[PDB]
RNA sequence: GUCCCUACUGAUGAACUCGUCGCAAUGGUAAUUCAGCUUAGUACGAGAGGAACCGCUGAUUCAGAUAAUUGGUUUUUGCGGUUGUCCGACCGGGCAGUGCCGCGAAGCUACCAUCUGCUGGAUAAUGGCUGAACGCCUCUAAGUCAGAAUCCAUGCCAG
RNA sequence: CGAGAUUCCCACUGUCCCUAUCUACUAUCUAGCGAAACCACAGCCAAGGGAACGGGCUUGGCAAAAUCAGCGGGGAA
């Protein structure tokens, strides 16, 4: 199966292609570079945008020398762009954060720093498992 | 506007009346979603030409409450009673009384 | 994906119409017509029973 | 007796469910396969509560509790608290707690006797945990991982622990708990035991991708089946473990 | 993993028809004499280049997709060699390369010719001539395509074993009962028809043995030929027996019903003995029910015991007809195989040095059992109900209701609506199916729920009565 | 559904009203309006701001004490359903509402 | 834009023509097919969703809903149409 | 997206010793007293052969092309005579010495060497690298340095911006010219060469001599003298060699077998190189990552250094290897020529080099100063022709399998097969890892695609090499055991494999289909193959630190 | 070696007495794809793996709408603050082609928000029924059944 | 107020866009005055019209006054 989440409601996607977001897990990366969003449609002149709970291709531009300049899938966990939730609640995060994930769903890291979105936690079970704060 | 969940005796019209329309005292129809036209305009309701093909129809609806805060601003007081109770007494009202 | 006008989808929609929405809309219109009725009840030529005349591009002028 | 079941298609039955001695909580789903598997394993001996916490699917990782009580976070609503209270019998206490660590199942792992908490847990939260759950609490990490509930699981008969835990760490952990412990893997080697499975005193539910050797070692450690396995069975078929896990 | 994902290859006429169909259909086709000569040559050279490209891509897919004989495990290389002559396969897959390369050579040749073409008829005849060259090349390639299609079909319909994994081979003379044994031990369909060469190919099944996978292979059989002359079926049999690192079972029967003398089986087994010397081998006396191990002659017993004398051989009895000992023999042989595998695994990592491997450290970490120093066992809460309820059985008619059956009766996944009200437990039953007030006068009814609120209201009313006596609302 | 209390502005924020912003250490703020959202973003002190309910509270302008104010508290232990309990709660809600109205009036009366 | 709605024309009548009514069969009981009101505005509601198979099933859902003020309508006439080869 | 986005970052390391067609103390070389004192303070007591051979030529003012590995002292070799020629700061406006280096790190290293060796002199040295302020570089040029150390692109940009006159430059140095050409600086290098006056002394220091570099030197240098690091191509007699014919599906397991038994490497972190010093040279960076991860899973102390690796990361890895914190070093070719490699004891080439001379360089990387070294090769059927080109280049007799009882592993090229039992067990464990952990499987797929691309992009062998490769494959020695496994082994496998040789040499009588039109085609085909005979924000009153922030704003306003 | 005519659309429009409610010839015509649950770890399968129908729920693109709620925009110059200048000073002013800074209604908006997107017949490849040519046979010759996102119309827009 | 403790950014470019600032250029209606270029006669479309010649002509499609605003079709080497 192609790496596109299934069963996701609409939201205000706020992470375009080529975005410097900060890293969440203890893999060692300091930031991830959104370069390609998996599952985005094919529209000309439209920059693919991603939201919480979507696996996005990421490249470590700043990080530990072991993990630097490395491309692997990663899923968005926190977005500072305001989005609404089916209980009619508009919310947004302080930063833009994602955790490095393999295409099946095994996260390279072990602990997730900071809070975790309910959308990411619900769409991916182990993010809920290894996430210490989800709100 | 009162629903079984909240026994708050109020009409469908929020605080201050509808903006640019007024206050309704009649039978009214509350329908989901955005609907073509603007305020004061005649709206023609009619039956569907064909029998329905989804559970969205013949899905029974149970309501909780209806937003009655003033739409003329970013108000959060549904009823004048709760508003005059929460704000307390004001000097102009005290001088009038 | 099958088109909205596909024969299979049309047949399934007809089955749904005849088996599911049918009785619900029937009972709905039954109570509606009942309330309609509640609200509603809430010489031949000289009498007008025989229909007469009131008060030509089909035939050529004569 | 451990059965392999899928919530929808995910093997993290521990993530989508919390199971204790006197009750078991199942998430609301489009289907009743998962609830039906639990009732099949438990034909109405204890209540099965179809619960949602804070409008979330992840009840297993968003609640933590034992027989004596259940703990749910601030984020849940009054409707859901009333759901838990009314569904749950009178013998069982239910409490909503205010913690920066919302994942209560993750930061809290507990049994009818003991409990383990996150290193950074608050003192007031610790004392409310203690008096609500009627258990004693230690502070400990599992293989240098802070999420004890996800990375490890408890049962009064025995426990399964993070695979990479050192021998000395496992020994001290087993001594402080007072129950037998074994380090092993679940869900075809998934490192997350607590997320992978949920276990009560007399049965277990795992994912389908769990292999037969780890199913057997789970049986032995948790004293399931006929109780023939206290772990001496694991030592007897060590050879199977050696070949499979080499 | 196998070789089924090998794309089909067409015959000569087919490949010509499809290649010419692509070059006809996928490109513009109309050109005019009034058009510029440069555009004419561009058109025709584009046609030629497209024909080259499609032919080259198809031949490249074919070659790079067929298996590379001398990079596979010796079992695989010799098995595909006996099934399919390796030298001849290789000369075929050769001709096809040389043919494709000649296609590209002709491609450049006619590209220069078209580039220096001077007229529409020039381009006409040049393109016709080039496409004729490729057509004739495939026409000569007619037979290799058929051969490669046949080898593709079989290599697709070829059993896929794992030489490394725990394996048990079953060998012997034909009609001894190998197929009967393999059907008894595993869930694999092998023809049990009673004629000499019933199975012309290796058959494969699988079993579980204390939660461990084993693969059982049934081989066709071997006669008294001294391996210099053989049928191809016996050759694939001996290749399996020689290159499959596995436990070996040799099935022989005391009754000569198989059609070979006990001396004949003895000679065959001593002939194949060096091929099995490294391994563990198990001679199984089948059909003991019709002819037991006692009644045959004492010197026959003596020679079979002299065969037993060696230390890497074992003797077992079995009767596949009634399944007298199939479970016991499989249990025992696989147990010894498991013990040997454990020994090898220990040695790999116990190699001389003094430092244990990281995998070995992990396996000790896994096998280690934790136990409290105090030696106390916590008291447990198992209830008598779940002690004496009945086990859940799907075929059982007098069954529980099940939420699944309620769902299926009342619709399906998206139809049935679950009702938590039936699961609600309340003091007064008709409490259920009642709405619960939530908000009232803009203040939360739940947040203001509290027991003894009657007494608290009485206290508040006393306080208000005291205030009223104080005149706490008078105007001055 | 539960009527939130606005952090900065104080007022009883309603569903579909206001925005929610939570900060990574783990704390969530519900803002009734963009006005209070922006006032909290700009690092203003709600104590310093005069229109804020909590300033009106700390200044003593809005009454601080009394059993009615101890009645308003977030409850943490749930209770089994009972029509009688809920209906006596509702009549108590009316009774408390008139309590709060009269006592706010008289508190302002002694303020002036 | 869509070709079914172009060229962009003004509405000839401010009211709005119904054009098509539901098909008639004699078997149903009698009923009117239409009604009129006036768009007053919209409000917000929250609802206990009862959509089986939905992610937000049995959860609070916030929606926007139009209010149409609908005073009782008065019957003042009947009309009889005949079917003809010209409609 | 960024998988081979542009190209495999390590392309190849092409060398052309045909560039040879171009043609004991410091006090004995008689340098100035101040330069001698600076050298003594730096600690250069005995000159290494590279500067011992080059400095007299540079003092004699001859153009120099120097074949020298990194770390031999090339920077000192071309700076000492430069300082000895300069001897003072010139009052006339105009730069006199120019050095062009690929990267800013190497430029900084050269700058540090220049400063340390010219401590005391009034020479003005400048650094012009990318990322620095153009205004600062303008100011430095206004201060008029005598020595310039720069990258080609930045130097060209500054020259174009300032209309700089280079007619006063008499000393030109090209540091790491092969790296310059690999990075593609050739166009602006030629532009700078054209801009420079003809009357200049040119030095070009490189580890390798590609054909493009040879052409550039021929076009731009006036009678260049080629100095080489002594016997860099002469294979040391103390080098022992063993080559193993291995299949692709068993090849990782064969590498593990060599590491486990042939070397008897300890597993785990080790308790100045080590006693084992296992280095592995591969073809692609994907191969480097795959092998490194597999070996760390196996339990080795592995440091990996590949071509396009981050500078700090490569320094940390090289430091770990040189200090003995790791025992294996995994490199292809580019990082190998880039980094400083100490004396090694074990060298293994995973992917066989295309060029015998690349092989010679990789085997001269070990067995130095009379110390014995070991070299193991993994050679496939496709890699055999390159092995044959290598044996022609080395002039060593070929021993296939066990044709000789005691072949000389140092003087004779000995090729054999590895032990079947341990080979199969390592293959099994490799397959188990590949099936279990998905990351390694993804690495396997990407390194397989990279290997396929490398097969397409690799330089081809000779027709005759292909020929006697066919006859070697026909010969029995290809499948026989290597001579290192023991005469008792030879005994057992000779007792056995002979009937196994008969099995492998089976000519089937008829195909199974012969056992239709397809069958008729097969029969006719058979008859045919019948063999031939920033100020703070304005203070807000409501803000808590209102007065403090107002004070900060006032202080910033006063500072301006 | 260099500004003309007119088709078309929209908005108007003279006379047919003015107005209301209608009909519909004609012209255009609109929906597309993917995903998840169940079926189901089932059919199949030596293993590995592994479907489809029915039913349900979402998402992409396109199209027509709308501002309940959330961001954005402030000749509402609304409220608060504030910079320097001169009129000797207060004063109120010119002042900075509307001074700047905070919050801000209404309106307008947003792939930065929400809603909606529909049914009958006839067909093409093909699969058939009956049955001649041709005493067997045959989907075809006569008669005829099913069948594609196809076509034609309804639903929709103009009138 | 706490040496208070912790977190984010700062580079260059002979690269692109936007916003901010400067200079310059930009303005409508009604009254009154009031030209010039150009003009054989007029301009719907399709096919045909030997000579790449169509606005005439043949056969058709069709064809309803008059304004304002957009819009696209024609005019040898
Ligand atoms: N009575 C008896 N007959 C057996 C037994 N095992 C095999 N047979 C006979 O074997 C016959 C079938 O041959 P297989 O079972 O296939 O023996 P095989 O060694 O596989 O040889 P093939 O027939 O060529 O496949 C049956 O008809 C049986 O009569 C046994 O245990 N008892
Ligand atoms: Zn506010």
Write the DSSP assignment of D124-185 as a string of letters. HHHHHHHHHHT-EEEE--BTTBS-HHHH-B--SS-EEE-TT--HHHHHHHHHHHTS-EEE--
**Rounded CA separation H228/H41 (Å):** 28
Instruction: Report the C-alpha gap between B5 and F1 in whole angstroms.
Output: 10
SS3 D92: coil
Does an interface of 3+ CB pairs under 8 Å exist between E and A?
no
Give phi and psi for H121, each to the nearest 5.
Answer: -75, 155
Q: Which nucleotides of J are covered by protein (CB under 7 A)?
A: 1, 8-9, 11-14, 52
Of the CA atoms within 13 Å of residue E399, those in its CB half-sphere come to 14
Residue G63 Cα, gap to closest chain D Cα (Å): 17
CA distances from E275 to C11, D136, H505 (A): 68, 66, 17
Separation of alpha carbons E436 and D83, rounded Å: 12
Between the CA of E198 and the centroid of ligand 1 the distance, in Å, is 10
G48 shares contact with chain A (CB less than 8 Å): no
CB pair distance less than 8 Å for D82 and F81: yes
Whether H542 and F44 have beta carbons less than 8 Å apart is answered as yes
What is the total residue count of chain C? 62
Element (H, E) at H471: helix H463-474
What are the residues whose beta carbons fall under 8 Å from the beta carbon of F61, sequence distance 6 or more? F111
Helix (H, G, I), strand (E, B) or coil at H424: helix
Q: For residue D29, give both structure tokens.
A: 């789903």
Ion ligand 2, residue ranges at CB < 5 A: F 9, 33, 35-36
Q: Is the C-beta atom of B53 closer than 7 angstroms to strand I?
A: yes
How big is the CA angle at E146 (ends E143 and E152), to the nearest 5 degrees? 140
* Ligand 1, pocket-test mutation among E175, E199, E287, most atoms within 8 A of CB: E175
Which nt is closest to the CA of H188, judged by C1'? J14
Question: How many Cα atoms are found within 13 Å in the side-chain-facing hemisphere of H169?
Answer: 22
Best residue of F101, F103, F111 to probe chain B, by most B CBs closer than 10 Å:
F101
φ, ψ of residue H401 to 5 degrees: the values are 60, -115
- Nearest 10 degrees: Cα torsion E216, E222, E228, E229: -120
Count of C-beta atoms within a 10 Å radius of residue E469: 8
**Structure tokens belonging to residue E442:** 């803009």
Pairwise CA distance, residues H462 & E41, whole Å: 38
CA distance D38 to D59: 15
User: What's the CA gap between F109 and E80, in Å, rounded?
Assistant: 104
d(CA D109, CA D60): 11
Q: By what method was this entry solved?
A: cryo-EM
Give the bridge partners for F68, in sequence order. Answer: none
Does an H or E element contain G46, and which?
Answer: strand G34-48
Ligand 1 site, residue E177, Cβ cutoff 6 A? yes
Q: Do the Cβ atoms of E247 and E282 come closer than 8 Å?
A: yes
- For G68, list phi and psi in degrees, rounded to 5: -120, 110
- A66: phi then psi, degrees, rounded to nearest 5: -65, -40
F26 to chain D: closest CA residue: D100
* Cα–Cα nearest to E54, from E91, E17, E86: E17
Task: Using a threshold of 3 CB pairs under 8 A, tell whether chains E and H touch.
Answer: yes
Tokens 């391996």 -> residue: E227
Give A33's strand partners: A20, A59
Residue whose structure tokens are 């869509």: G2
What CA–CA distance (Å, rounded) separates H70 from H72?
A: 6
Q: Which of A83, A86, A121 to mutate to test the interface with G (most CBs of G within 10 A)?
A: A86
Q: Does the beta carbon of E286 lie inside 6 Å of ligand 1? A: yes
d(CA B22, CA B24) in angstroms, rounded, equals: 7
Contact D28, G50 (CB under 8 A): no
d(CA H456, CA H437): 29
Query: What whole-number distance in Å separates Cα of residue H291 and Cα of residue E164?
Result: 22
Q: Which ligand is nearest to the CA of E221?
A: 1
Name residue, tokens 């499989």: E330
Q: What is each CA distance from H246 to D195, H212, H249, in whole angstroms?
A: 44, 35, 9
Residue written as token pair 């990407």? H446
Exposure string (b/e) for A104-116, b if CB count within 10 Å is 16 or more?
Answer: ebebbbbbbbbbb
Place of tokens 């109770």: B85
CB-based contact E218:E161 (threshold 8 Å): no
E74 in Cβ contact with E163 (< 8 Å): no
CA E303 to centroid of ligand 1, rounded, Å: 24
Q: Put the strands of the sheet holding E213-218 in their side by side order.
A: E203-208, E213-218, E167-172, E247-253, E281-286, E313-317
The answer, yes or no, to whether any atom of ligand 1 lies below 6 A from the CB of E319, is yes
Residue H174 half-sphere exposure toward CB, CA atoms < 13 A:
31
Kindly report the number of other CB atoms within 10 A of residue F107's CB atom.
Answer: 18
8 Å CB contact between E197 and E236: no
Please classify residue H446 by burial: count the beta carbons closer than 10 Å to its beta carbon, then call 0-12 exposed, 13-18 middle and 19+ buried: middle
Output phi, psi for D50, to 5 deg.
-80, 95
B3: left (phi over 0), alpha (psi -120 to 50) or beta: beta
CB A82: neighbour CB atoms within 10 A?
Answer: 15
- CA D164, D168, D173, D178 torsion-angle sign: positive
Q: CB neighbours of D192 closer than 8 A, spacing ≥ 6?
A: A126, A129, A130, D12, D150, D151, D186
**Residue B83 and residue B77 in contact, taking contact as beta carbons nearer than 8 Å:** yes
Least Cα distance to F74 among D120, D55, E446, E118 occurs for E446
DSSP state for residue D56 in the 8-state scheme: B
Q: How far is the CA of E171 from the centre of ligand 1 (A)?
A: 13
From the CB of residue H316, how many other CB atoms can be counted at a distance below 10 Å? 16
Ligand number nearest to the C-alpha of B75: 2
Instruction: List the structure tokens of B74.
Output: 């970013």
Question: Residue G1 CA to J68 C1' — how many Å?
Answer: 26
Separation of E34 CA and J41 C1' (Å)? 39
Q: Which of residues 16-55 of F touch strand I (CB under 7 A)?
A: 16-19, 31, 33-35, 37-39, 42
Is F86 at the interface with chain D, CB within 8 A? no
Asked if A80 and A93 touch (Cβ cutoff 8 Å), the reply is yes
Q: Do A65 and H312 touch (CB under 8 A)?
A: yes
Do H83 and H118 form a contact (C-beta atoms < 8 A)? yes
Give the residue nearest to nucleotide I105 (CA to C1'): B73
Report the 10 Å Cβ neighbour count for H128.
Answer: 24
Q: Give residue G75's region: left, alpha or beta (phi > 0; psi -120 to 50).
A: beta
> Which one of A94, A113, A131, A134 would you mutate to disrupt binding with F, by most F Cβ within 10 Å of its Cβ?
A94
Beta pairing partners, A85: A89
CB D101 within 8 Å of CB A116: no
Of the candidates E327, E365, E382, the one whose C-alpha atom is nearest the C-alpha of residue D1 is E382
Distance CA E448, CA F88 (A): 11
How far apart (Å, rounded) are the C-alpha atoms in residues A82 and H308? 39
Distance in angstroms (rounded) separating the CA atoms of residues G69 and G37: 6
Q: Could you tell me the two tokens for D69? A: 């009580």
Quote the crossing angle between the two packed helices E86-115 and E37-65, to the nearest 10°. Answer: 170
| H158, closest nucleotide (Cα–C1') | J14
Decide: residue E270, CB within 10 A, 0-12 exposed, 13-18 middle, 19+ buried: exposed
* Residues H425-437: b if buried by 16+ CB within 10 A, e if exposed: bbbbbbbebeeeb
Question: Any idea how long chain B is?
Answer: 97
CA E236 to chain CA centroid, nearest Å: 22
Q: Chains F, A in contact: 3+ Cβ pairs under 8 A? A: yes
Paired tokens of C51: 């229909």
| F20 sits in which H/E element | strand F19-23
**E194, E197, E256: residue to mutate for ligand 1 pocket, most atoms within 8 A of CB:** E194
**Position of tokens 């294979």?**
H235
Angle, helix E86-115 to helix E74-83, in steps of 10 degrees? 80
The DSSP element (H or E) to which C47 belongs, if any, is helix C44-47
Q: CB of E369 within 8 A of CB of D231?
A: yes
Which of G61, G33, G42, G71 lies closest to B36, judged by CA? Answer: G42
Scan for tokens 């590379």, then name that residue.
Answer: E68
Q: Separation of E176 CA from ligand 1 center, angstroms? A: 5
Cβ contact B5:E437 at 8 Å: yes
Nearest residue, CB atoms, A132 vs list D56, D75, D101: D101
Distance between the alpha carbon (CA) of B32 and the C1' atom of I114, Å: 10
Tokens of H239: 């080098």
Cross-chain residue pair F16–G60, CB shorter than 8 Å: no
CA distances from C40 to B26, C25, C37, E161, F11 (A): 21, 22, 5, 84, 51
The 3-class secondary structure across H201-265, one letter per residue, is EEEEEECCCCHHHHHHHHHHCCCCEEEECCCCCCCCCCEEEEEEECCHHHHHHHHHHHHHHHCCC
CA distance A133 to B93: 49
- Give G61→chain D minimum CA distance, Å: 11
Q: Which of residues 26-45 of G touch strand I (CB under 7 A)?
A: 41-44
Q: What DSSP state is assigned to residue A12? A: -
3-class state of residue H553 by DSSP: helix
Give the SS3 label for residue H92: coil
Going by alpha carbons, the residue nearest to atom 6 of ligand 1 is: E177
For chain D, report the end-to-end CA distance as a whole number of angstroms: 26
CA angle H293, H298, H303 (to 5 degrees): 45
Q: Does E28 touch chain B (CB under 8 A)?
A: no
Is there a contact between H431 and H412 (Cβ–Cβ < 8 Å)? Answer: no
Contact partners, residue H422, CB within 8 Å, separation at least 6: H257, H260, H261
SS3 per residue for chain E: CCCCCCCCCCCHHHHHHHHHHHHHHCCCCCCCCCCCHHHHHHHHHHHHHHHHHHHHHHHHHHHHHCCCHHHCCHHHHHHHHHHCCHHHHHHHHHHHHHHHHHHHHHHHHHHHHHHCCCCHHHHHHHHHHHHHHHHHHHHHCHHHHHHHHHHHHHHHCCCCCCCCCCEEEEEECCCCCHHHHHHHHCCCCCCCCCCCCCCCCCEEEEEECCCCEEEEEECCCCCCCCCCCCCHHHHHHHHHHHHCCCEEEEEEECCHHHCCCHHHHHHHHHHHHHHHCCCCEEEEEECCCCCCCCCCCHHHHHHHHHHHCCCCEEEEECCCCCCCCHHHHHHHHHHHHHHHHHHHHHHHHHCCCCCCCHHHHHHHHHHCEECCCCCCCCCCCCCHHHHHCCCCCCCCCCCCCCHHHHHHHCCCCCCCCCCCCCCCCCCCHHHCCCCCCCEECCEECCCCCCCCHHHHHHHHHHHHHHHHHHCCCCCC
Percent helix, strand and coil across chain H, each to the nearest 5: 50, 10, 40
């Amino acid at each position: 199966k192609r790496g596109a989440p299934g069963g996701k409601l609409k939201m205000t996607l706020g992470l375009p292609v080529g975005a410097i977001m900060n890293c969440a897990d203890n893999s060692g990366a300091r930031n991830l570079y959104i370069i390609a969003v998996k599952g985005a449609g094919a529209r000309l002149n439209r920059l693919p945008a991603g939201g919480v709970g979507d696996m996005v291709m990421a490249t470590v531009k700043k990080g530990k020398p072991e993990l630097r300049k490395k491309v692997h899938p990663a899923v968005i966990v926190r977005q500072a762009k305001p989005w609404k939730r089916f209980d009619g609640v508009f919310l947004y995060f302080e930063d833009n954060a994602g955790v490095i994930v393999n295409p099946k769903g095994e996260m390279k890291g072990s602990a997730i720093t900071g809070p975790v979105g309910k959308e990411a936690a619900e769409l991916w079970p182990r993010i809920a498992s290894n996430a210490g704060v989800v709100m | 506007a009162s629903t079984e969940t909240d026994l708050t005796k109020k009409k469908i019209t929020p605080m201050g009346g509808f903006v640019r329309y007024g206050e309704v005292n009649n039978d009214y129809v509350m329908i989901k979603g955005s609907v073509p036209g603007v305020k004061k305009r005649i709206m023609t309701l009619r039956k569907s030409l064909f029998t329905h093909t989804s559970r969205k129809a013949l899905e029974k609806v149970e309501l909780k409450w209806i937003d009655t805060s003033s739409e003329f601003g970013h108000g959060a007081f549904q009823t004048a009673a709760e508003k005059k109770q929460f704000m307390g007494t004001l000097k102009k009202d005290l001088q009038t009384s | 994906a099958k088109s909205a006008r596909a024969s299979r989808i049309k047949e399934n929609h007809q089955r749904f119409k005849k088996n599911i929405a049918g009785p619900v809309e029937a009972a709905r219109l039954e109570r509606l017509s009942a309330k309609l009725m509640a609200i509603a009840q809430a010489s031949g030529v000289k009498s007008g029973k025989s229909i007469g005349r009131k008060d030509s591009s089909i035939v050529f002028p004569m | 007796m451990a059965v392999r079941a899928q919530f929808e298609n995910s093997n993290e039955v521990g993530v989508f469910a919390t199971l204790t001695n006197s009750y078991c909580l199942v998430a609301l789903g489009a289907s009743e396969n998962f609830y039906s598997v639990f009732e099949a394993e438990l034909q109405d001996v204890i209540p099965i509560c179809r619960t949602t916490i804070a409008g979330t699917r992840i009840i297993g990782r968003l609640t933590a509790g034992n027989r004596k009580g259940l703990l749910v976070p601030t984020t849940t609503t009054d409707q859901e608290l009333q759901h838990l209270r009314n569904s749950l019998p009178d013998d069982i206490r239910i409490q909503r707690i205010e913690e920066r660590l919302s994942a209560l199942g993750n930061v809290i792992v507990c049994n009818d006797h003991t409990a383990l908490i996150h290193p950074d847990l608050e003192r007031e939260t610790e004392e409310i945990i203690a008096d609500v759950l009627g258990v004693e609490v230690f502070r400990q990490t599992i293989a240098d991982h802070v999420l004890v509930g996800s990375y490890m699981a408890l049962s009064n008969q025995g426990g399964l622990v993070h695979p990479k835990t050192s021998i000395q760490d496992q020994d001290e952990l087993s001594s402080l708990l007072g129950v037998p412990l074994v380090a092993g893997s679940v869900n075809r080697g998934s490192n997350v035991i607590g997320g992978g499975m949920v276990v009560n005193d007399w049965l277990a539910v795992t994912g389908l991708d769990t292999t037969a050797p780890e199913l057997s070692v789970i049986e032995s450690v948790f004293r399931l089946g006929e109780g023939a396995g206290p772990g001496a069975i694991n030592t007897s078929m060590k050879n199977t473990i050696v070949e499979s896990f080499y | 993993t196998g070789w089924k994902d090998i794309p089909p290859v067409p015959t000569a006429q087919e490949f010509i028809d499809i290649v010419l169909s692509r070059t006809q259909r996928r490109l513009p086709t109309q050109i005019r004499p009034g058009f510029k000569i440069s555009r004419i040559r561009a058109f025709y050279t584009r046609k030629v280049k497209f024909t080259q490209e499609t032919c080259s891509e198809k031949f490249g897919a074919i070659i790079s997709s067929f298996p590379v004989l001398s990079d596979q495990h010796p079992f695989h290389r010799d098995l595909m060699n006996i099934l399919y002559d390796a030298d001849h396969f290789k000369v075929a897959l050769g001709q096809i390369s040389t043919a494709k390369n000649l296609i590209e050579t002709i491609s450049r040749d006619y590209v220069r010719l078209l580039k220096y073409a001077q007229s529409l008829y020039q381009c006409k005849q040049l393109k016709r001539a080039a496409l004729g060259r490729m057509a004739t090349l495939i026409k000569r390639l007619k037979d290799p395509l058929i051969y490669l299609d046949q080898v593709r079909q079989h290599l697709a319909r070829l059993p896929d074993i794992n030489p490394t994994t725990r394996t048990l081979l079953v060998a012997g003379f034909p009609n001894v009962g190998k197929s009967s044994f393999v059907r008894s031990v595993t869930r694999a369909d092998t023809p049990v028809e009673p004629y000499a060469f019933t199975t012309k190919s290796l058959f494969v099944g699988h079993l579980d043995y204390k939660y461990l996978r084993y693969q059982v292979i049934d081989t066709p059989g071997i006669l008294d030929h001294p391996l210099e002359e053989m049928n191809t079926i016996e050759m694939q049999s001996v290749t399996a027996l020689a290159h499959l690192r596995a436990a070996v079972l040799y099935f022989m029967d005391i009754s000569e019903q198989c059609g070979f003398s006990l001396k004949a089986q003895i000679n065959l087994f001593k002939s194949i003995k060096p091929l099995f010397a490294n391994k563990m081998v198990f001679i199984v006396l089948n059909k003991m029910d019709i002819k037991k191990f006692e009644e045959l002659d004492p010197e026959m017993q003596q020679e079979i015991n002299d065969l037993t004398k060696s230390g890497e051989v074992e003797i077992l009895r079995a009767s596949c007809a009634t399944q007298e000992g199939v479970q016991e023999v499989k249990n025992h042989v696989c147990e010894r195989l498991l013990v040997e595998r454990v020994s090898q695994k220990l040695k790999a990592g116990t190699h001389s040095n003094g430092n244990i491997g990281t995998r070995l450290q992990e396996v000790m970490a896994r096998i280690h059992v934790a136990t409290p120093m105090d030696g106390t066992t916590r008291e447990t809460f198992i209830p008598e109900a779940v002690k004496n309820l009945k086990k859940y059985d799907k075929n059982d008619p007098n069954r529980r209701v099940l939420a699944r059956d309620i769902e299926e009766a009342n619709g399906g996944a998206g139809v049935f609506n679950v009702d938590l009200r039936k699961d609600w437990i309340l003091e007064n039953p008709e409490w259920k199916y009642d709405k619960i007030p939530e908000i009232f006068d803009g203040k939360n009814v739940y947040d203001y729920i509290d027991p003894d609120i009657d007494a608290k209201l009485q206290a508040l009313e006393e306080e208000e009565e005291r205030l009223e006596k104080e005149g706490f609302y008078d105007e001055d | 559904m539960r009527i939130e209390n606005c952090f900065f502005c104080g007022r009883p924020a309603w569903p579909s009203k206001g925005i929610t912003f939570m900060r990574n250490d783990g704390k969530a703020f519900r803002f009734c309006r963009s006005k209070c959202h922006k006032n909290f973003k700009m690092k203003r002190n709600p104590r310093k701001l005069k229109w804020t309910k909590a300033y009106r509270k700390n200044a003593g302008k809005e009454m601080v004490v009394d059993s009615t104010l101890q009645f308003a508290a977030r409850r943490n232990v749930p209770v089994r359903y009972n029509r009688e309990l809920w209906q006596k709660t509702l009549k108590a809600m009316e009774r408390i509402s008139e309590i709060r109205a009269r006592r706010e009036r008289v508190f302002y009366k002694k303020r002036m | 834009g869509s070709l079914a709605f172009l060229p962009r024309k003004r509405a000839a009548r401010h009211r709005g023509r119904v054009k098509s009514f539901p098909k008639d069969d004699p078997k149903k009981p009698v009923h009117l097919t239409a009604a009129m009101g006036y768009k007053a505005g919209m409000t917000t509601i929250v609802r206990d969703l009862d959509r089986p198979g939905a992610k937000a099933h049995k959860k609070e859902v916030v929606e926007a809903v139009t209010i149409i003020d609908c005073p009782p309508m008065v019957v003042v006439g009947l009309v009889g149409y005949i079917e003809t080869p010209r409609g | 997206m960024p998988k081979r986005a542009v190209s495999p970052a390590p392309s190849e390391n092409e060398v052309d010793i045909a560039g040879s067609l171009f043609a004991g103390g410091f006090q004995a070389m008689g340098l100035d007293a101040n330069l001698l004192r600076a050298i003594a303070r730096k600690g250069f007591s005995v000159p290494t052969p590279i500067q011992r051979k080059t400095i007299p030529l540079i003092l004699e003012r001859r153009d120099v092309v120097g074949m020298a590995r990194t770390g031999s002292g090339k920077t000192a070799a071309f700076v000492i005579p430069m300082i000895e020629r300069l001897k003072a700061h010139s009052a006339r406006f105009g730069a006199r010495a120019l050095v062009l280096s690929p990267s800013r790190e190497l430029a900084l290293q050269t700058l540090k060497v220049v400063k340390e060796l010219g401590k005391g002199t009034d020479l003005k040295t400048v650094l012009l690298v990318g990322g620095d302020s153009l205004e600062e570089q303008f100011g430095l040029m206004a201060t008029n340095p005598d020595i310039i150390i720069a990258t080609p692109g930045r130097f060209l940009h500054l020259k174009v911006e300032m209309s700089l006159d280079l007619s006063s430059i008499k000393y030109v140095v090209f540091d790491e010219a092969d790296r310059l050409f690999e990075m593609g600086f050739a166009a602006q290098l030629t532009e700078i060469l054209h801009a420079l006056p003809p009357s200049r002394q040119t030095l070009l220091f490189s580890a390798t001599l590609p054909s493009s570099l040879v052409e550039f030197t021929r076009a731009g240098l006036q009678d260049p003298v080629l100095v080489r690091l002594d016997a860099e191509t002469k294979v040391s007699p103390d080098l022992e060699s063993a080559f193993f014919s291995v299949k692709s599906g068993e090849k990782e397991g064969a590498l593990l077998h060599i590491l486990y038994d042939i070397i008897k490497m300890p597993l785990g972190d080790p308790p100045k190189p080590t006693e084992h010093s296992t280095i592995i040279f591969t073809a692609t960076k994907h191969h480097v990552e795959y092998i490194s991860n597999l070996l760390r899973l196996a339990g080795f102390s592995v440091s990996y250094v590949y071509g396009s690796l981050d500078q700090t990361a490569r320094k940390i890895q090289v430091d770990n290897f040189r200090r003995g914190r790791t025992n294996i070093l995994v490199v292809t070719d580019v990082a190998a020529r880039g980094i400083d490699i100490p004396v090694l004891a074990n060298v293994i080439n995973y992917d066989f080099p295309p060029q015998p001379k690349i092989f010679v360089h990789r085997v001269g990387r070990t067995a130095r100063a009379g110390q014995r070294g070991w070299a193991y090769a993994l050679v496939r059927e496709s890699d055999l022709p390159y092995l044959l080109d290598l044996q022609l280049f080395l002039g060593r007799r070929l021993v296939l399998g066990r044709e000789e009882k005691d072949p000389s592993f140092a003087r004779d090229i000995v090729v054999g097969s590895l032990k079947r039992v341990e080979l199969e067990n390592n293959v099994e464990w490799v397959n188990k890892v590949l099936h279990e952990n998905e990351d390694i499987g993804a690495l396997k797929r990407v390194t397989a695609k990279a290997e396929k691309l490398y097969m397409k992009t690799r330089n081809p062998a000779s027709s005759q090499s292909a020929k006697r490769a066919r006859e070697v494959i026909v010969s029995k020695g290809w499948g026989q055991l290597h001579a290192i496994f023991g005469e008792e082994a030879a005994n057992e496998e000779q007792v056995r494999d002979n009937l196994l040789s008969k099995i492998t040499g089976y000519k089937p009588q008829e195909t199974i289909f012969e056992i239709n039109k397809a069958a008729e085609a097969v029969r006719s085909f058979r008859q045919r193959i019948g063999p031939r005979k920033k100020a703070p924000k304005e203070a807000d009153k409501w803000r808590d630190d209102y007065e403090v922030r107002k004070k900060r704003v006032a202080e910033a306003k006063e500072k301006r």
